[PDB]
Design an enzyme around this catalytic site. Structure first.
Site, PDB file in Angstrom:
ATOM      1  CB  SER A   1      42.968  34.017  37.587  1.00 43.43           C
ATOM      2  OG  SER A   1      42.858  34.921  36.594  1.00 43.43           O
TER       3      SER A   1
ATOM      4  CG  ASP B   1      49.888  36.507  34.830  1.00 39.61           C
ATOM      5  OD1 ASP B   1      49.110  36.952  33.968  1.00 39.61           O
ATOM      6  OD2 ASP B   1      49.643  35.930  35.518  1.00 39.61           O
TER       7      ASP B   1
ATOM      8  CG  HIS C   1      46.796  34.104  34.420  1.00 34.18           C
ATOM      9  ND1 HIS C   1      47.247  34.868  35.290  1.00 34.18           N
ATOM     10  CD2 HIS C   1      45.850  33.745  34.286  1.00 34.18           C
ATOM     11  CE1 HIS C   1      46.009  34.854  35.945  1.00 34.18           C
ATOM     12  NE2 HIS C   1      45.288  34.173  35.587  1.00 34.18           N
TER      13      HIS C   1
HETATM   14  O1  XOV Z   1      43.020  28.455  34.130  1.00 34.91           O
HETATM   15  C1  XOV Z   1      42.731  29.364  33.622  1.00 34.91           C
HETATM   16  N1  XOV Z   1      42.921  30.533  34.238  1.00 34.91           N
HETATM   17  C2  XOV Z   1      41.774  31.376  33.650  1.00 34.91           C
HETATM   18  C3  XOV Z   1      41.311  30.666  32.522  1.00 34.91           C
HETATM   19  O2  XOV Z   1      41.701  29.352  32.906  1.00 34.91           O
HETATM   20  C4  XOV Z   1      42.088  33.016  33.514  1.00 34.91           C
HETATM   21  C5  XOV Z   1      40.629  33.423  34.150  1.00 34.91           C
HETATM   22  C6  XOV Z   1      40.622  34.510  34.970  1.00 34.91           C
HETATM   23  O3  XOV Z   1      40.301  34.345  36.196  1.00 34.91           O
HETATM   24  N2  XOV Z   1      40.879  35.796  34.397  1.00 34.91           N
HETATM   25  C7  XOV Z   1      41.488  35.826  33.288  1.00 34.91           C
HETATM   26  C8  XOV Z   1      40.820  37.028  32.539  1.00 34.91           C
HETATM   27  C9  XOV Z   1      40.942  38.279  33.163  1.00 34.91           C
HETATM   28  C10 XOV Z   1      40.191  39.370  32.644  1.00 34.91           C
HETATM   29  O4  XOV Z   1      40.283  40.663  33.407  1.00 34.91           O
HETATM   30  C11 XOV Z   1      39.584  41.775  32.720  1.00 34.91           C
HETATM   31  C12 XOV Z   1      38.686  41.764  31.619  1.00 34.91           C
HETATM   32  C13 XOV Z   1      38.059  42.831  31.227  1.00 34.91           C
HETATM   33  C14 XOV Z   1      37.682  43.819  32.315  1.00 34.91           C
HETATM   34  F1  XOV Z   1      36.832  44.837  32.012  1.00 34.91           F
HETATM   35  C15 XOV Z   1      38.311  43.724  33.655  1.00 34.91           C
HETATM   36  C16 XOV Z   1      39.308  42.596  33.875  1.00 34.91           C
HETATM   37 CL1  XOV Z   1      39.915  42.630  35.374  1.00 34.91          CL
HETATM   38  C17 XOV Z   1      40.300  38.017  34.547  1.00 34.91           C
HETATM   39  C18 XOV Z   1      40.962  36.871  35.475  1.00 34.91           C
HETATM   40  C19 XOV Z   1      41.004  31.908  35.105  1.00 34.91           C
END
Ligand code: XOV
Length: 288
Positions: free
Chosen positions: A116, A233, A263
């Site tokens: 992620s 996802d 995810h």
């Molecule tokens: O096991 C796990 N996985 C996890 C948690 O625990 C998921 C988390 C992780 O890295 N993200 C999930 C949320 C996402 C939000 O994305 C945005 C939100 C607002 C915005 F303005 C622009 C973007 Cl891009 C980014 C990536 C790691």
């Protein structure tokens, strides 16, 4: 005495100090011998290195030395929770940690594993040392902003909000979308080292910085990589995985799609999780 945000002394914990003088908690999973190679593990937003326990144990089982730290503002590391001055802090801090382990274990190959946001960090890490890393394992990496809420308007709006209320947050993201495995959604929801507070606009914007930089880095990326992605996802859309396969110049690139998976593929339904561990095992085995 300097304490973790959970009030435990840094004196008693494996750690390092970043360029900005912040303490980052460190985990190690070392094999008995001299190892075949090093692999840094890069966790995502709101989580921490401890969630990579089973993956790390398996990778140590292959005579690799696994290392990780909690990113600034995450887990057992210092910083206001889930904010960062600029997204490049995360990358700089990975490169600091990598260079330290290479001085200690010279002439060894180093791999990256990221999930992620951690995948975004892995990609930017490899893009800044072209030709240096031996391989990169990406589990549903952040490569692409969700198109409905990345409109010209909603970005400008975000920037205008950031300049007035950088700490303004939306609701907590529905954590049910992480995994079909409801046990793992329950483990996420009850881990004290996870930040489940809503994302702040200042952090929201740094994730868009990451998306922009990843996309601009893809065409010049040549590192070998394994890419694992779920079809259903709702956080990192399967389209982004396809884009990575299209734009990366890497001669050695493999995509596996898990049909119906959410995810967190390494914490998904056992059928998926076991295939994920098996494929990371096989892909790293062959390249060591
Ligand atoms: O096991 C796990 N996985 C996890 C948690 O625990 C998921 C988390 C992780 O890295 N993200 C999930 C949320 C996402 C939000 O994305 C945005 C939100 C607002 C915005 F303005 C622009 C973007 Cl891009 C980014 C990536 C790691």
């Amino acid at each position: 005495p300097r304490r973790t945000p959970q009030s435990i002394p840094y004196q008693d914990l494996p750690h390092l100090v970043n360029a900005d003088g912040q303490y980052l908690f460190c985990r190690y999973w070392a094999p008995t011998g001299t190892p075949k190679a090093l692999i840094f593990v890069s966790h995502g937003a709101g989580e921490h290195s401890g969630r990579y326990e089973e993956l790390a144990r398996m990778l140590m089982g292959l005579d690799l030395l696994v290392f990780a730290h909690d990113h600034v503002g995450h887990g057992q590391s210092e910083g206001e929770r889930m904010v960062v001055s600029d997204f490049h802090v995360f990358v700089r801090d990975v490169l600091q940690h990598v260079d330290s382990m290479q001085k200690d274990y010279p002439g060894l190959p180093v791999f990256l594993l990221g999930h992620s946001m951690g995948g975004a960090i892995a990609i930017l890490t490899a893009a800044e040392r072209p030709g240096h890393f031996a391989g990169m394992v990406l589990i549903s990496p952040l490569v692409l902003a969700n198109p409905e809420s990345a409109t010209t308007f909603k970005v400008l709006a975000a920037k205008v909000l950031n300049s007035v209320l950088p700490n303004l947050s939306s609701g907590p993201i529905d954590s049910s979308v992480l995994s079909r495995n409801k046990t793992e959604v329950d483990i996420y929801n009850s881990d004290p080292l996870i930040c489940r507070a809503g994302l702040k606009v200042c952090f929201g914007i740094q994730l868009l910085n990451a998306v922009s930089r990843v996309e601009r880095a893809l065409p010049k990326l040549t590192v070998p990589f394994l890419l694992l992605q779920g079809s259903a996802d709702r956080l990192c859309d399967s389209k982004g995985a396809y884009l990575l396969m299209e734009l990366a110049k890497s001669q050695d690139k493999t995509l596996k799609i898990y049909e119906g998976a959410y995810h967190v593929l390494h914490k998904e339904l056992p059928e998926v999780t076991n295939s994920v561990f098996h494929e990371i095992n096989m892909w790293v085995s062959q390249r060591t």
